[PDB]
Amino acid sequence: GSQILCVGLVVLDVISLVDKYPKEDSEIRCLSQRWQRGGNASNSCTVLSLLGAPCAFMGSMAPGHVADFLVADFRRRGVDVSQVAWQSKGDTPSSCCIINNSNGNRTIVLHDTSLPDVSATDFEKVDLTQFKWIHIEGRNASEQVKMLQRIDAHNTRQPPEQKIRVSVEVEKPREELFQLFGYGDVVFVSKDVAKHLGFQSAEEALRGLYGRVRKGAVLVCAWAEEGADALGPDGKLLHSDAFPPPRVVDTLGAGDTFNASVIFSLSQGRSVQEALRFGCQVAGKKCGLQGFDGIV
Amino acid sequence: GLVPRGSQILCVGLVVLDVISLVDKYPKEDSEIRCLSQRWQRGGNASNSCTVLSLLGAPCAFMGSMAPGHVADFLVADFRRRGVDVSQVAWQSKGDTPSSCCIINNSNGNRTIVLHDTSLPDVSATDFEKVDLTQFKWIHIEGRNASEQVKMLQRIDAHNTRQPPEQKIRVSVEVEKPREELFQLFGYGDVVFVSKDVAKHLGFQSAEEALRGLYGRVRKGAVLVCAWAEEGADALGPDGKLLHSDAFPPPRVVDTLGAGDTFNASVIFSLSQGRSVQEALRFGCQVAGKKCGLQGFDGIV
Numbered sequence A: 001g002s003q004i005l006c007v008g009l010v011v012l013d014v015i016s017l018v019d020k021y022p023k024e025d026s027e028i029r030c031l032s033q034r035w036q037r038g039g040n041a042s043n044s045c046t047v048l049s050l051l052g053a054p055c056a057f058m059g060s061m062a063p064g065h066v067a068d069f070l071v072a073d074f075r076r077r078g079v080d081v082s083q084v085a086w087q088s089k090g091d092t093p094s095s096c097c098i099i100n101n102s103n104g105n106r107t108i109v110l111h112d113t114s115l116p117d118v119s120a121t122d123f124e125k126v127d128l129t130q131f132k133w134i135h136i137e138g139r140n141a142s143e144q145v146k147m148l149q150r151i152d153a154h155n156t157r158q159p160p161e162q163k164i165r166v167s168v169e170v171e172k173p174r175e176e177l178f179q180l181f182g183y184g185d186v187v188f189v190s191k192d193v194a195k196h197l198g199f200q201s202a203e204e205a206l207r208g209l210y211g212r213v214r215k216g217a218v219l220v221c222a223w224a225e226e227g228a229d230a231l232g233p234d235g236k237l238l239h240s241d242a243f244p245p246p247r248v249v250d251t252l253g254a255g256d257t258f259n260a261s262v263i264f265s266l267s268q269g270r271s272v273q274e275a276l277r278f279g280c281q282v283a284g285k286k287c288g289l290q291g292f293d294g295i296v
Numbered sequence B: 001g002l003v004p005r006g007s008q009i010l011c012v013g014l015v016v017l018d019v020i021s022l023v024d025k026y027p028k029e030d031s032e033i034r035c036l037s038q039r040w041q042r043g044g045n046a047s048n049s050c051t052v053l054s055l056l057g058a059p060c061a062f063m064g065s066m067a068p069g070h071v072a073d074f075l076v077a078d079f080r081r082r083g084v085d086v087s088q089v090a091w092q093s094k095g096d097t098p099s100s101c102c103i104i105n106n107s108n109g110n111r112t113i114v115l116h117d118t119s120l121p122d123v124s125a126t127d128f129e130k131v132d133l134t135q136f137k138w139i140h141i142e143g144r145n146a147s148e149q150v151k152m153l154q155r156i157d158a159h160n161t162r163q164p165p166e167q168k169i170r171v172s173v174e175v176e177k178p179r180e181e182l183f184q185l186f187g188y189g190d191v192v193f194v195s196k197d198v199a200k201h202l203g204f205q206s207a208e209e210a211l212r213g214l215y216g217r218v219r220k221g222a223v224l225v226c227a228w229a230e231e232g233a234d235a236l237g238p239d240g241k242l243l244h245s246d247a248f249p250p251p252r253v254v255d256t257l258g259a260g261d262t263f264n265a266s267v268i269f270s271l272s273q274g275r276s277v278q279e280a281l282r283f284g285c286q287v288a289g290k291k292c293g294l295q296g297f298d299g300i301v
């Protein structure tokens, strides 16, 4: 019961830092270039390790030079990679990321390689006893629902002391994913998902979507410079203002920084109000830096 | 390994990692989109010419700057896949190996480019000074850091002054970017390639106007070459006779990216084989024309 497991993607982010977003059909020179290990669940692992939490990553990878870079990076951060679902078919996903240096906007052109996703069968092979918290990045929802039902079954057969806490992230406005609201102790819904469902604020989104979550669950919604909100079974809307840096230079992975910091803070026994504030704190620090070094 | 004396064609210039993403529509800033297809390609003018020289059957070498890392590893493996000798690469302790991001909009064909940064130092005259030239029969320089490259060209002239005519290294220069720094390179080389883009920027409206207008800038006995896309290519040498070749357009134009580099490498190859300027012009148009109907460099020969 010592690790935080993050289930989701690992993508190679080929970053270009620009002073202005390029206008279509133009040729701009970038300020700098870097490779960064990406993917939501993968980014959350980086943050958890920097926060001082033992963590594990579970996701699909295909042997090759890109996976070698990603594995070395994960290992350099002390992220346990023993749960990786190695694939014989597909290439490693990669994306071209344009980071605007004047406002931190990040634009991602993802190349999804048909790498088969982590299956309920792959998850069934995992001994859950070493995990205190399991975070699932919403992707192949029907297959992830089965993984979540397995954690519930495990929890039924354990005393309250040994129960594995569960969190779910619904970040893409894909209908398949909306069934994941009914699973997990903590549900993270993105601003992009909330806006697609017709909500114009975090408070509105929480009130509107709370009926979709499991009994006793906490629904969390971060809203960029507007900070973040959370709503629990007691019906009290919780809010935290953002901690924006004086100069916002990179928001790539700011959402993942928030998620990991909220999870970390809750796994440490802190209240929802303290976890919300801490998430905004670390996410805000991240936005004033390139990458993840120096967030703590 | 052992490279026989006077056997290679050396190409000095840029190697870049081109990341090309094909999209339905141009992404709006701060959005996360999925591309239709994505490819990692080795680019750069001198780099592209090396590929073509290898496919033509010429032993060839590339000289350019690279920084140790995963990008350089991809580029080196891609050079090797194309039989290019990479032993002359100027490995750098500072800077990033060039990488570019191209976004191609599938609904209108628009190409948006986020060019490589300027962090990596270019090949210097002192890096070039360390090269034993005896293994090269031809040295092609892609015009970049002109003041440094002029010194490299002066070193080849000095080498040649002490050589019998049969052991003289032939030299070619490409002025492809409309940068004033580069215009001093016209006065160097046996063969000078000037691009249509450079010629137009200098106010020339045809390969003929460009050659007649710029010939006064080349050294005694040099051949000035100018390809003009579908209008074919022209050359002008010391005899004052303007030479022309019509283009050999493919039945359907597929990919013109690196067609200029294909022309340059084919002209060089043909001249290094002892063919005349007229024959080299025609051969350059033929290979460049074949390339335009092909994706990449496979099947150009």
Ligand SMILES: C[C@]1(O)CCN(c2nc(N3C[C@@H](O)[C@@H](O)C3)cc(C(F)(F)F)c2C#N)C1
Pocket (backbone or CB within 6 Å): A103, A104, A105, A222, A223, A224, A225, A226, A242, A243, A244, A245, A248, A251, A254, A255, A256, A258, A280, A283, A284, A285, A287, B030
């Ligand atoms: C958990 C998060 O919601 C993920 C995104 N995020 C932030 N996004 C910001 N922007 C994204 C894009 O809309 C830009 O125009 C500005 C700006 C900031 C801030 F300014 F506060 F630093 C934060 C913070 N933290 C926190």
Ligand SMILES: C[C@]1(O)CCN(c2nc(N3C[C@@H](O)[C@@H](O)C3)cc(C(F)(F)F)c2C#N)C1
Pocket (backbone or CB within 6 Å): B227, B228, B229, B230, B231, B232, B247, B248, B249, B250, B253, B256, B259, B260, B263, B285, B288, B289, B292
């Ligand atoms: C050595 C070269 O001059 C460099 C470019 N080139 C061509 N460019 C063409 N363009 C089409 C358009 O996309 C523009 O880039 C110009 C069309 C053709 C042709 F139609 F003839 F095949 C050729 C040929 N050969 C040969």
